[PDB]
Amino acid sequence: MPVARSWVCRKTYVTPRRPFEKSRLDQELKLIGEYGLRNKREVWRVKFTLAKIRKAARELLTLDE
Amino acid sequence: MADIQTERAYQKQPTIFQNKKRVLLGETGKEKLPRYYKNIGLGFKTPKEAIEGTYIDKKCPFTGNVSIRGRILSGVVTKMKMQRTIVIRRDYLHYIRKYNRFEKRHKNMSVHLSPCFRDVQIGDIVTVGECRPLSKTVRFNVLKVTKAAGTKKQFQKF
Amino acid sequence: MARGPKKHLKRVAAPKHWMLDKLTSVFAPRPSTGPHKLRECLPLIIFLRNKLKYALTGDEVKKICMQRFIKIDGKVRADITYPAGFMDVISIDKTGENFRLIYDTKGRFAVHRITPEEAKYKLCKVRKIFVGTKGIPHLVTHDARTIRYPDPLIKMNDTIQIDLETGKITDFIKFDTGNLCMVTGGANLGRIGVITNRERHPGSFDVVHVKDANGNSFATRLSNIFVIGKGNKPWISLPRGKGIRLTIAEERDKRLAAKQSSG
Amino acid sequence: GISRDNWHKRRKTGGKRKPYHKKRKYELGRPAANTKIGPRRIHTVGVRGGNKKYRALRLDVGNFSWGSECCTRKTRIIDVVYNASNNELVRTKTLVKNCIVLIDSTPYRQWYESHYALPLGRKKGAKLTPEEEEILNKKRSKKIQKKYDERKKNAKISSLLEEQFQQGKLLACIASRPGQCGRADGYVLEGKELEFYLRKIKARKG
RNA sequence: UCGCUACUACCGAUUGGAUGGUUUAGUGAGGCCCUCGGAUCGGCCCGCCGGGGUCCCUGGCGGAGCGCUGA
RNA sequence: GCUGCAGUUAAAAAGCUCGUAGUUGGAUCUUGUGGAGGGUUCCCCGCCCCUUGCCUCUCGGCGCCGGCCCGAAGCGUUUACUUUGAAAAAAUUAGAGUGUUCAAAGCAGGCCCGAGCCGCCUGGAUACCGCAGCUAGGAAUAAUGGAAUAGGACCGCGGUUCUAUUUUGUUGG
RNA sequence: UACCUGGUUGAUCCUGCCAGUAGCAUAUGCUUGUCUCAAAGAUUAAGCCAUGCAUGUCUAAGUACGCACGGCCGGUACAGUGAAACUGCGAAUGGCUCAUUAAAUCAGUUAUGGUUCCUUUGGUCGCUACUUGGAUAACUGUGGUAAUUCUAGAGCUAAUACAUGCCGACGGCGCUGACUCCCUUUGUGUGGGAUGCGUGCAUUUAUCAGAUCAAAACCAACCCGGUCGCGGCUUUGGUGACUCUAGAUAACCUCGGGCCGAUCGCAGCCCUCCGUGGCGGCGACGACCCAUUCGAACGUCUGCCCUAUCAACUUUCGAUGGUAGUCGCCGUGCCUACCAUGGUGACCACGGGUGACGGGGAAUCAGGGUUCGAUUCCGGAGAGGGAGCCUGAGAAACGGCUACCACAUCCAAGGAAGGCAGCAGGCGCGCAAAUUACCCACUC
């Protein structure tokens, strides 16, 4: 049936491709410990908003001044 | 020419009438029939053979009961075994976008060709316009014939 | 199946220029059959409820209309989904105010208040000319009005002025180069300029070129051109912004500089 | 029931097509009128949009034009003599557009004789003098004989019609659609049309 | 090659079995169209009575022809 | 595997040659000085030889004391290509504004005395929308075409046949 | 974020595949505190369905003798609220599902100069009459069957239902032409003129006219400025294009079977005027014809998944085309008679397959791609399977009807009734999908 609802939503983070990379594990824990966070998802949110900002600036730098 | 009533019913143009009064002509005579013909528009020109002729054809653009509207197209004359109709070929290139390359294709049209064009041949170029449906498979009618942009009929002196 | 005509309209299918919200409902008002096309009108309920805000619900609109307060082209209309459109006048004699429907430069109907002596006439574009029995000449306008015995100089695409108390012709403007016009369809909807060239094709569509007050140039199909003044001067008062269509960078800079919207 | 659709039949290539939907009402057809000669019997049908159509089953009379003389009158229909489409239609006497028919000459003869002040259909003096000579000759002050040169210098009819008038019957052609209009109505054969159909009638049986 | 234990497919007697689509010859419900049919129901023409009037209107009872004419 | 794979020995070149459709196909036919924007010569005007390549009308405004000039039109051998106009539902996607307590969302919202303001300001952008059809500039590259059984052209002549039925004062001859 | 790692050997370098790694969407296991959103019997079986609901409707203004309720008393048509019944309108939209369907549906693009159109909006609405006819329902009264939203016989009465039909405003203008008057016995130029016939818009057929351009010279008779040979001219509208629109003539006409009002409600008026002749203010409802609006239908150009263990196919059993007609809202082999011998294909026809409804779109993605789309917006199709048809502006309708085929309920065995792929709910199926709840407050 038709209904007055809406269905727009999206995810705000992405999971890393290598699960057990030693160089990645302790770097993420040092950010959790210095800023007082709850879990890894709370770090992966901030990497995703920065990646979207840099993806837009890299497009605009192709166009003529 | 000298006879046209080859059918079981009498053949005439609508909208033309012959007076049965003041009929005297003496030792000679003149045409009992005036001729109906019209302008098509769109910058086309009516053939001399339609105005000076004596044929009957109701589907003719110049001397019959059709209206030229919508698309104007062209193609190459390729077969003509039917009577007052011909087949023409249209060739084109189709783009396939996964590759960056083209593909050759064709289609055929059956079209109505009146008298007033009488020297057409296979490999001539023809221009056509839309009509109302004229038969089961026919929707287009010949407006102009040419052999420009190509080799002669017989030798170069033609 | 479809065994006859339809009588509903879904809210995501409704015309974009009405600016209906997404979440109150499934349906929108289907405009009543009438003088203007379904895509090109404004239903009276959307004007009273959503634009002027005199009513909070469709029932508060119904009990404004049934008291006989609302006039369109000088006639009282009780129908809440009546299709009002371009150049029409709405009068509300109880509050003492008058309006005319004209496009905003972003392609939507503005509210535009007018003085009561300007509420006495409207401008009409000619659609057809023909001769009836006994040789009597007839005229047809863009809003379905039929007139007998027009002036024999009035031709196709011209603009005529009529008085609303009697419905008879008073004066007219010829379609020719140098006259002022407004654009009533396509992407250039709601722009104003002078006619500068007409380019014609036998079969298919003619194209008109138009020039702005700031010297910009734009074009459209001849069916989208409405003439509004002989030479440089209009026969009607015009809304804020006067059809000039400034770009998004100019609009940003005035919004920062003027500090409007309570900055 | 009966229907007039395009989708029941094959395409240009010779290939079949499968049905797209059930039969719709706007694709309808109905049986033929098969109009006979006889005293008036007409029936009416309701058609798409709520309009009415008239179907003639029997007709005895029609309206016909003698276009050469600008004369038209209501006239009795006698018989059918030629049909270009099918011989069973003349064997069973059915009336349709462009059928060839025989009609009563009388109302044209009466118009001509009173308009031109001359006889037309007459054989010998026994069918001229004993009655109705007072249609031809009367007192006419300054309009007696010479002023009728406006008539008499253009009165001569074609030899092919003067041979028909003496038999009391003219050939005519049906121009209306009797199964659609309820009327049988047309024009008198003349000139090269009359020569064409007289040759076709004679060449079939005579 | 021969032999033991699992598992998958082939050939085939059996005039095998179930379901579905094409199609020859014969039959054919029900609607619609056409040519007929005519149960039954009215009006207009001939008495007497009554209301109005210079024997007719017109209500009612009633019988012969049930004419003529409509559904 | 188009960008972008492989076939001596790991899987894989028909035993050999001809040949119609399909795909692909050699070279060639008009340039440098002067001025603007910009440089220290090349992209827009006008020129060695042609610059819209021609042309001369007529219904129709301009410039000036009738005649001669300058904007339409016949149109530039025909197409692909490329650049520009027009015309194509909304929602979704991209994207601008905006402290839903933040966010996913939504289309809102913001000023001021107290209530005597009988209120005021402001949004609901914009882009994209293959192919096919329509439209106006460019002319390299790739198709396509003209006189060899000579035809283009001159305010050039001539025989003969058809013929509109204008200009004459009209209806008829 | 444009990426790789384990496994053939005694050890080495390759080929190559298996296994690992990350997302997405269906089922399933273990586990669970707060708060804002919200998909949900598509996959198998378009399989079968107990019970309840899902479409009705009245204003000042079509018909009020219901004692049904009621007033200060009375019908001056007749008060006032008003059940029932007749009449009008709607029920062809909405909602559900995805079986069929490969140039079909569908998308972009164009066309009706080849058609139809309830309603809205604007034109148009003057070739017994101070008001006609009979007959039914509600109601009253008497019944039949095991049984249904089954209906029969008898007594009453209405209209905006059904059927008739004037008055007013004929005074049209063309054609006939007894007679009569004037220049010239006729002819030929005149002006009168007794008397007949037809004379609005629609309908069927036939005929007529539609004006414009270049240059002179003779002749009959004259427009006209003038008199017994020269100057000067005139007449619906429109398209790229009509056998268009408007006009003139001769007939037709549908009748029982085209229009031109025998209708309803508020405030009262002005007078050779005392309640009369009318003229008139506001409407309501209705109907023939144009133009609109909402559409519908038919046609143009270009665009499609796999298959040759499908290479030739179609063709009076209409295949391609011509001439005349029938039928239809209209173009057309749509169908019939006669005639011709055509039409499509290696640039893949014709045939077969599809766990195939098409599109806007969705997941994944360096650049290029691969896979998916039953599903809230738009288009199509269908209500167990096939077929036929009534009513209406619109249906080949299934919350309409008739029959065959498959299921199946009640019975007094004579008969009668039926269609959840609407909302809840049930059975069957299967790995697989929620309550027989409340309300018209919001949106329409």
From Swiss-Prot, chain A:
For this chain, the family text in UniProt reads: Belongs to the universal ribosomal protein uS4 family.
Give the UniProt subcellular location, in the record's own words: Cytoplasm; Nucleus, Nucleolus
Its biological purpose is as follows: Component of the small ribosomal subunit. The ribosome is a large ribonucleoprotein complex responsible for the synthesis of proteins in the cell. Part of the small subunit (SSU) processome, first precursor of the small eukaryotic ribosomal subunit. During the assembly of the SSU processome in the nucleolus, many ribosome biogenesis factors, an RNA chaperone and ribosomal proteins associate with the nascent pre-rRNA and work in concert to generate RNA folding, modifications, rearrangements and cleavage as well as targeted degradation of pre-ribosomal RNA by the RNA exosome.
Assembly and interactions? Component of the small ribosomal subunit. Identified in a IGF2BP1-dependent mRNP granule complex containing untranslated mRNAs. Part of the small subunit (SSU) processome, composed of more than 70 proteins and the RNA chaperone small nucleolar RNA (snoRNA) U3.
Q: Which gene encodes it?
A: RPS9
What is the official name of this protein in its record? Small ribosomal subunit protein uS4
**Any transmembrane segments, and where?**
none
From Swiss-Prot, chain B:
Query: Family assignment?
Result: Belongs to the universal ribosomal protein uS17 family.
Main location per the UniProt record: cytoplasm
Query: What GO cellular-component annotations does this UniProt entry give?
Result: cytosolic ribosome; cytosolic small ribosomal subunit; nucleolus
- Stated role: Component of the small ribosomal subunit. The ribosome is a large ribonucleoprotein complex responsible for the synthesis of proteins in the cell. Part of the small subunit (SSU) processome, first precursor of the small eukaryotic ribosomal subunit. During the assembly of the SSU processome in the nucleolus, many ribosome biogenesis factors, an RNA chaperone and ribosomal proteins associate with the nascent pre-rRNA and work in concert to generate RNA folding, modifications, rearrangements and cleavage as well as targeted degradation of pre-ribosomal RNA by the RNA exosome.
Q: Which Pfam families match?
A: Ribosomal_S17 (PF00366), Ribosomal_S17_N (PF16205)
Which PANTHER family does the protein's record reference?
Answer: 40S RIBOSOMAL PROTEIN S11 FAMILY MEMBER, SMALL RIBOSOMAL SUBUNIT PROTEIN US17
Chain positions with Citrulline modification? 22
Mind listing the UniProt keywords for this protein, alphabetically?
Acetylation, Citrullination, Cytoplasm, Lipoprotein, Methylation, Nucleus, Palmitate, Phosphoprotein, Ribonucleoprotein, Ribosomal protein, RNA-binding, rRNA-binding
Q: Which Gene3D superfamilies match?
A: 2.40.50.1000
Identify this protein by name: Small ribosomal subunit protein uS17
Question: Which post-translational modifications are recorded for this protein?
Answer: Citrullinated by PADI4.
N-acetylalanine modification sites are 2
Q: Name one GO molecular function term.
A: structural constituent of ribosome
Q: Residues bearing Phosphoserine?
A: 67, 110
UniProtKB/Swiss-Prot annotation, chain C:
Domain of life of the organism in this record?
A: Eukaryota
GO BP terms in the entry: translation
The cellular location(s) given in this protein's UniProt record come to: Cytoplasm; Nucleus, Nucleolus
Please report the organism this UniProt entry assigns to the protein. Answer: Oryctolagus cuniculus (Rabbit)
| The S4 RNA-binding domain, residue ranges | 42-104
PTM sites of type N6-acetyllysine: 233
The gene for this chain is: RPS4X
Classification via Pfam families:
40S_S4_C, KOW, Ribosomal_S4e, RS4NT
Gene3D superfamilies attached to this UniProt entry = 2.30.30.30, 2.40.50.740, RNA-binding S4 domain
Write the protein's name: Small ribosomal subunit protein eS4
What does the function comment of this entry state?
Component of the small ribosomal subunit. The ribosome is a large ribonucleoprotein complex responsible for the synthesis of proteins in the cell. Part of the small subunit (SSU) processome, first precursor of the small eukaryotic ribosomal subunit. During the assembly of the SSU processome in the nucleolus, many ribosome biogenesis factors, an RNA chaperone and ribosomal proteins associate with the nascent pre-rRNA and work in concert to generate RNA folding, modifications, rearrangements and cleavage as well as targeted degradation of pre-ribosomal RNA by the RNA exosome.
Position of the Glycyl lysine isopeptide (Lys-Gly) (interchain with G-Cter in SUMO2) cross-link: 230
Q: Which PANTHER family match?
A: 30S/40S RIBOSOMAL PROTEIN S4, SMALL RIBOSOMAL SUBUNIT PROTEIN ES4
GO CC, one annotated term: cytosolic small ribosomal subunit
A molecular function annotated in GO for this UniProt entry is:
structural constituent of ribosome
Keyword terms, alphabetized: Acetylation, Cytoplasm, Isopeptide bond, Nucleus, Ribonucleoprotein, Ribosomal protein, RNA-binding, rRNA-binding, Ubl conjugation
Q: Which family does it belong to?
A: Belongs to the eukaryotic ribosomal protein eS4 family.
Q: Which SMART domains match?
A: S4
From Swiss-Prot, chain D:
For region Disordered, the annotated ranges are: 1-26
Query: What keywords were assigned to this record?
Result: Acetylation, Cytoplasm, Isopeptide bond, Lipoprotein, Membrane, Myristate, Nucleus, Phosphoprotein, Ribonucleoprotein, Ribosomal protein, Ubl conjugation
- Keyword Zinc assigned to the entry: answer is no
Chief subcellular location: cytoplasm
Q: Which residues lie in coiled coils?
A: none
- Sites of the modification Phosphoserine? 159
Q: Where in the cell is it found?
A: Cytoplasm; Membrane; Nucleus, Nucleolus
Q: Where is the lipid attached (N-myristoyl glycine)?
A: 1
Question: Entry's Gene3D superfamilies?
Answer: 3.10.290.70, Ribosomal protein S8e, subdomain
Write out the similarity annotation: Belongs to the eukaryotic ribosomal protein eS8 family.
Q: What does this protein do?
A: Component of the small ribosomal subunit. The ribosome is a large ribonucleoprotein complex responsible for the synthesis of proteins in the cell. Part of the small subunit (SSU) processome, first precursor of the small eukaryotic ribosomal subunit. During the assembly of the SSU processome in the nucleolus, many ribosome biogenesis factors, an RNA chaperone and ribosomal proteins associate with the nascent pre-rRNA and work in concert to generate RNA folding, modifications, rearrangements and cleavage as well as targeted degradation of pre-ribosomal RNA by the RNA exosome.
Q: Which PANTHER family match?
A: 40S RIBOSOMAL PROTEIN S8
Q: What is this protein called?
A: Small ribosomal subunit protein eS8
Q: Could you tell me which species this protein originates from?
A: Oryctolagus cuniculus (Rabbit)
